[PDB]
């Protein structure tokens, strides 16, 4: 559902951006999190769907 | 008003949860915001914690900053609105103080104990 992502995928994206080191690991999570909001307006829910499951992978490596 | 000491309870502990900022709790804040308000309060919290967002504490305070909340006042308008307002404060672990802020939160709610904020306004002090 499009709201369901927006909170898990604004959490999760929160989680990352305050696990990551260098510049390069916090324009990563800023690109995929911005990419996960812009995906949900253009209401492409099912593509939102799995950018937000690259940034839930990113989360797995980060820990 | 057995029921509006009641409702005043609720109405702190909520601007409480949703305006402090412990980095170690964001996942039971967001569960207690999910389950104390409406999915338009709800969103707009989440809305605003983004990190799209350039005011969001996590951008701002990181890992290093936790925000706590004072309840100062509680205007109650009616059974359904009330006019909280509080002081902010952010320190890091060393406690050298960065925010000290002054907030009012209009917030519309229904309570029976089923508490559910319908309606949340910030405004500066």
Do not use: C, P
């Given at each position: 559902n499009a709201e369901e992502i927006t909170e898990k995928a604004?959490?999760?994206?929160?989680?990352?951006?305050?696990?990551?080191?260098?510049?390069?690991?916090?324009?990563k999570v800023r690109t995929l999190?911005?990419?996960?909001?812009?995906?949900?307006?253009?209401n492409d829910l099912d593509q939102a769907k799995r950018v937000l499951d690259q940034l839930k992978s990113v989360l797995e490596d980060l820990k | 008003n057995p029921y509006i000491s009641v409702?005043?309870?609720?109405?702190?502990?909520?601007?409480?949860?949703?305006?402090?900022?412990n980095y170690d709790t964001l996942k039971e804040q967001f569960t207690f915001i999910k389950n104390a308000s409406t999915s338009i309060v709800?969103?707009?919290f989440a809305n605003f914690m983004n990190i799209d967002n350039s005011l969001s504490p996590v951008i701002r305070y990181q890992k290093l900053y936790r925000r706590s909340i004072?309840?100062?006042?509680?205007?109650?308008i009616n059974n359904n609105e009330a006019?909280?307002?509080?002081?902010?404060?952010?320190?890091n672990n060393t406690g050298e103080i960065?925010?000290?802020?002054?907030?009012?939160?209009?917030?519309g709610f229904i309570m029976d104990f089923?508490?559910?904020?319908?309606?949340?306004?910030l405004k500066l002090l």
């Open positions: 604004t959490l999760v994206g929160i989680e990352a951006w305050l696990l990551a080191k260098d510049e390069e690991q916090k324009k999190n911005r990419q996960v909001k812009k995906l949900l307006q253009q | 409702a005043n309870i609720m109405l702190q502990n909520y601007v409480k949860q949703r305006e402090k900022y709800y969103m707009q004072n309840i100062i006042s509680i205007n109650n006019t909280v307002t509080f002081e902010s404060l952010a320190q960065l925010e000290n802020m002054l907030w009012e939160a209009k917030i089923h508490f559910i904020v319908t309606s949340y306004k």
